[model samples]
Target: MFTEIMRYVLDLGPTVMLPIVVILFSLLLKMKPGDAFKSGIHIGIGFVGIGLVIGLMLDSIGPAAKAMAEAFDINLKVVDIGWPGSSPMTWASQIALIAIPIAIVVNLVMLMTRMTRVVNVDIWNIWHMTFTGALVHIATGSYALAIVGVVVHAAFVYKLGDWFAKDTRDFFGLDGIAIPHGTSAYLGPIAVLVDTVIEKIPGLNRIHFSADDVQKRFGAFGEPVTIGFVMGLVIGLLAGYEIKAVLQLAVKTAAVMLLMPRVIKPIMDGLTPIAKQARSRLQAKFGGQDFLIGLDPALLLGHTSVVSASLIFIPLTILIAVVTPGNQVLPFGDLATIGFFVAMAVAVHQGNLFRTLISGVIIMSITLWIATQTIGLHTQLAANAGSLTGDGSLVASMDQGGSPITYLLVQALTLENVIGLVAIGALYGIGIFLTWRRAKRFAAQAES
Candidate 1:
């Protein structure tokens, strides 16, 4: 019955399900019933809009992506079973039934005690943490360890939410909200590292490829539409497409430039009220404690730079997979929405695509390596959840499966892969501290 209910709920998709959550949450926060419903629809419409746009992008570019891959003879064994595959595997685990309530309890106590201020209402994304739990349970055969994994994961991300709140507001213009989970936050520290290192080199420090700079210098050629069209033309030509198909792709890619940021308007409108009210309500009731409305990372994906980067990554990720040593998983399922991974890089670079491109390569290379490491366990996870495609092949993904946080937690407990644990754990631990230090300076600069 638990599995059945969860299956039904998630099956509704974010467009349908998140709005239901927002409506109920808004009413609980004492919003007017009518406006609550409107807010829900607004957010839902935003999701639907992004969903349609993303689908259009993938449908248009997917064939060319595959064509490019085959032309290059880039083949790998493991299939990327993305969220659609990863989510059910989590729900099917024993911990899924209890993970949500536990995560909420942790959130409340943490917020109450002033331990953290990330008011996480995105319960559906709790699955990310639960998958960590599920994997730990598999590793240790101990429920206590699994539960601890979830708690630690939750605590870690809430702090991440707090840390990145200013960055989100300053760069993404998403005031009063934070994205704690998802690849963006976890991989964000690498961008911070890259930016910090580059700032020291005089020549590199002066380089900037921001859209604003391009617009100033090149006029019409610097326009995002022109940039998009050029990128599409090159990508299509590289994929061996004829002129007609390339032209179609060029026009569609340019359309993405025009449409992507526009879709975020409704989301900002919908979430603004709730984010504002939730802030006051939490402060007023919780004795002046400030709070950030925790949110899905999709908000970051709709930015102009992120949308453009998303398309470029479809081809680049394949190129990355081809080059990454010991990587067996072909970048498939997560290819279309590659923006999720680079959103923070764009923000950290202040929309400088050159910096983003460099950081993006580092980020995806690490993700592929981590994803490759977890494929054995991930395959077990899929088979256990009955989600395997029944084709006798392995499954992996570049999101949670590629996450250093999950990988570190799972590896530390199991110690099954000691060399991997040491390398990943050390690098990630250093990155976390670096991010923590940078967060202070960022907030000091903005104070939002």
Candidate 2:
């Protein structure tokens, strides 16, 4: 009953279901049905517009990734099955249905109690939380510990959602929304930590620029469209494509640059009214309070900086994977979507590509390191889900599967990997502290 119901909704994909969720949300906020329906329909078309653009971008990246992998002759044992494979595994987990409702309750309680301001309506992404729960179930065979895992993970990302709220608003131009779950949110602190260090050095401290700054300073030469083509040309060239094919990739990349912000406009148009209504209508109980609708990190790819970094990382990630010491997981499946991991870095670095590149490398390094450690757990979860292919390859994902929080948790519970536990625990502890400070700074500056 549960899976089938959820499956029916999820199979419709975010485009169809996000609108449905938005409509329901609008109605709850006392919006008229007609207006709610229009918001839903408008947002629906927004998703379609985004999907259409990515359909072209992904078309270029996937084959390019395969080619890059082959050209480098970087063979590895553990395959990066990615979020596509990992998300489904969580969906099929024994604790998933239970985990889902628990997270919803957890979020509502957190919102009401003001423990977090992230009002999560993106039900589907709770699979990220379900993932930690399912893994706990597998590890201890205790549903109680399993539930705790989900709650703990849920708490962490929502807090992350709070910390990065302004980054989403100011840098990514996402208002009344937050990314509470994803590699982007969890790994975001690493960027802040690196920034604290970047601040200490004289040259790096002042070195910062954004996509638009370049466009204004250099005129047409630095436009996002041209930037896309130039980056595409380099990526295709590196992928060993001929000059003709390289420009083709360049053209498509240019289209992505030209169209990404355009597509994001409709979603904002739909959401603007709802955000305003919710702000104005909810007075005392929710008064003077900032509310954010937790959303998918997928939206981050729309930024010119984000989209450009996504392309740059596709090649850079492969290089990092190949050179990483004792790394076994190939960065194949998640190559096309590497932006999600660094999406927050753009915000943290204030969309400075130079800092973003450095921050991204550090993030990817830690990601690969943690992912390698979790291969056993990752494989077991896949096997439990019955989602494993017959190929017998040990599967891992570079996304949630590589999360430092998840890694710290299981290691803390089991104490099986002491070195890793202590190492990442301290490193992540420092990063999180930095994130808290940075978040406080953001809070301090806001006029509200």
Candidate 3:
């Protein structure tokens, strides 16, 4: 019964889930029924638009990745079917059935007790936690531990969302919102630390570049479409495309750059009213105490820096995959979603393209390594869960496969990997310290 119910929910997809969430959350924030319904429908429409854009872009990216692999004679054993390939298997698992309720209950408890400020509504992303749980279950052959794994990871995700809420809201002009989805969200601490280190550097701190800087310096040539076209042309050349194919790639890439922002505008259009209403109600009820709105990392992909940085990394990630020994996964499927991976890094870097690019390269490298390391476990889980067709072969989603936290959790769960366990504990300790320090500073400012 649980499996069937979850399957139905998964079938409805984010388009349905997001709308329902918007309506309910809007009503929770005291929005009028008519307004809530309209907002929900608009948000759903926006998501549909986003889905279409992403699907179209992936159609292009997949072929390009294939061409790059063939052209470079890169023969990775593990197939990169992307996040779409892995997500269905994750939702099929029993862990997914329980992960939703566990996540919502934990989030509510956290919000009520002031342990977290973000009200996470990106429920579709609960799959990340479920995937972790499923992996642990496969590794340890224990269902109870799997549940614990899911809840703990979901709780950590909320905390990360809360800890970075201020910066996310301010940097993106997103008011009350925060992103809680993706491997990128888990890298928040890394971005924070890296940006801090860069700030303290002497000459390096002064070197900065941004999308706006390009626009100012290059005038019309600096626009996203032009940049996209040029990057696409370069990528096509790298992929050994002929002149005609190169021009086509350039047009498609330019189209993606232009269309993405247009699609996101409607999403923001739907979210803006809810955020405004939520803010007013919270201020009125709690005397200006802020509530963080948790959303998907997709919300940040419309930024120019995010798009630019992501495009730059597509080829770089491919290069890393080719040369990096032991990297089985080829990084094809989720290549289109690179923007989500670097959104936080760019936000933390204050939209500095150079810093964001540097962070992106490091992050992608780590992701590829983690993905490669976990293919054995990932293949086992997929086969056991009935997602794979044959035995003793490998499959991985580049996006989720490359997740540092997921890799750490799986290793820690096995009990043999003490180093991974130590790293996990150390990460949590650092996270707690950062959150505590930030909370104190916030409280101090409020008092002043």
Candidate 4:
């Protein structure tokens, strides 16, 4: 299984491309190199958290989903996104057997090395929520799942923030201060006031624009939560209609019940100055050095762990894609698709929608190019005995039918080396363009 897994990873390019492009763009955006590396590491941890959380969360949802499917008389079976084979064990048991041990090891190692602190748990949890939610939505192709995932994930910071605030106290003599959470809700909308107040001062116009003020204006459980919830349910209803199985939808609602408090807790934490400061500080520094630290902080960003993530996962995607051709409906696909969006998110962080779109296009173009060139590799997975234990998703379905698009491009080319290059270029373009555009506008205004 290990060798088979390894075989699946080496052939794809996004595994390397995502972090590389992100780091390069960060550098181009004038983010400190060390900070960029640290961000990549954070994202890497996020991916692991995503996998584990999805696995665990799925444990809760799967049986309910299967049960609902039984009542509706649908033929679909809910499978674990991460592994192969049907175990006699229950979903919770399987998750405990697999996910808990890994989570413990990660927690232990993080504590022992001081590589992770208490707050890191929140970060990892948020990462997990973001991905698992998204993947579930993707697999089931249910908009309700997608939207619920976003809300639950968005609200997760509140619980995470509280945990961080409380846990950090054990490490030091300091008393735990309640950390406010809900960045997009509490802080974001409140930021409108903050931004308006700040905008009265010269040279501060750009900073406050992101004030997601609507979240604040509407109260704690406003459009972000209520509308988001309804939107997801509506979408799921539309996609599956009442006629199709509502198991995915049922699981979505159930997951939301579990997700609300934990999600909202982080919002309160984000409102706390201490939490903000701690998080910012953690992101900015990499082992006592700044961007001035080293030329190859890029190495840190693309470290072995991240490499292992991409390396192991890309081929894994291909193998799954190959064996599970036409089975595009699987939750795990969300985790993989997220790599592209992670790139897009950073691009948005840099600036306008146009710039982000350009970066996304570049990254996608390069990724597709590489995958297109390597079609055979994905199909090759079918030959192994490994193909017998198919998981019934797009990636796993490849055993029954071969993927022409995904197999040829994503699994083979190795040439999609440009995803990073294009993303980096997008940053450079934006930086230069913004500076030049500002200068031109300033000169024109003076002439007028």
State each candidate's clash count.
0, 0, 0, 51
lDDT of 2 by residue, 13-96 (tens): 777888888899889989999999998888778778877886776688667776787687766668788887898888888777
Q: Which one wins by TM-score: 3 or 4?
A: 3
**Each prediction's TM-score against the native?**
0.90, 0.93, 0.90, 0.31
On residues 1-448, what C-alpha lDDT tens digit does candidate 3 reach at each position? 8767866776787778778878998888878999889878877887887887788677875577567766666677677767787788787787777788899998999888878877887778888888888878887889998888887788888878776776666776666777777866787666665666688999989898887888899988998888989988887887788899889988888887888778767766778898787777778776767777677777677677777877788787778777665576777777767777878888778888778867766666667767877787788768867877756578777766766667677777676667745754575456456654665676578569
Ranking by TM-score: 2, 3, 1, 4
Candidate 1 global Cα RMSD: 2.7
All models: lDDT? 0.82, 0.83, 0.76, 0.31
Best by TM-score: 2
Badly placed stretches (over 4 Å) of model 2 are 1-4, 28-32, 216-218, 387-391
lDDT of predicted model 3: 0.76
Q: What does the lDDT come to for candidate 4?
A: 0.31
lDDT of candidate 1 at residue 434, scale 0 to 100: 82
Clashes of 4: 51
Q: RMSD in angstroms, all models? A: 2.7, 2.1, 2.7, 17.9
In candidate 3, the residue pairs with backbone N, CA or C atoms under 3 Å apart (3 or more residues apart, or in different chains) clash, namely none
State how far residue 324 of model 1 sits from its true place (Å): 2.5
Worst 10 residues of 4 by lDDT: 290-299
**TM-score winner between candidates 1 and 2:** 2
- lDDT measured at residue 279 in model 2 versus the true structure, 0 to 100: 81
